Amino acid sequence: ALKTFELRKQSQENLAEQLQELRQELASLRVQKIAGGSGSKLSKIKTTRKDIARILTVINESNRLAAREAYKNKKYIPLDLRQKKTRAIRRALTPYEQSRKTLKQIKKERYFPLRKYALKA
């Protein structure tokens, strides 16, 4: 079985040959299944399918991380790379601009804050 960690520590072009070889192997296995194949071949069909899925996952994550590195510290970045929590969360006021205050309120909070007090018995 193809394991993701040595899949990740290779290059994109090398993984391209592995992906194409796996696709050809799946095509051969499907031809074997329709011409009459054993359970061993039919089990290799699902194994090859998952190996293709693992490789395609590795290509996509390498591509996305490269896009993240290229767009790091950029004011505008691709939408799919931005946050997706909820539509409302993205539309809400940020904590910075929720906490913005006038100089009138800054003076009031500076000079007369809520005091820590206690009462004697």
Binding site: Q83, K85, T86, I89
Partner: protein
């Protein structure tokens, strides 16, 4: 007041499949779905048809996104990979 001998002339659809709701309720000549109101932006919906609402309301389908959102809410909408 004509029954048989009059049902034999019925071979002309008045409704076809709707592209939005998938039901055989799309009036051809009106170009409107009697079920969901397509092509209107809103969905045909009426409070007298309470059973009609529950036949197609939220949860009767897959809710694939809403299930994902609920899982993400339970853990606080965090992003990144665990260390």
């Amino acid at each position: 007041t004509k029954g048989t001998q009059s049902f034999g002339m019925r071979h002309n659809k008045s409704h076809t499949i709707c592209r939005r709701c998938g039901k055989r309720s799309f009036h051809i000549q009106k170009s409107t779905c009697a079920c969901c109101g397509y092509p209107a932006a809103k969905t045909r919906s009426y409070n007298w048809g309470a059973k009609a609402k529950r036949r197609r309301t939220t949860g009767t389908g897959r809710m694939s996104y809403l299930k994902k959102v609920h899982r993400s809410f339970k853990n606080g909408f965090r992003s990144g990979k665990p260390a």
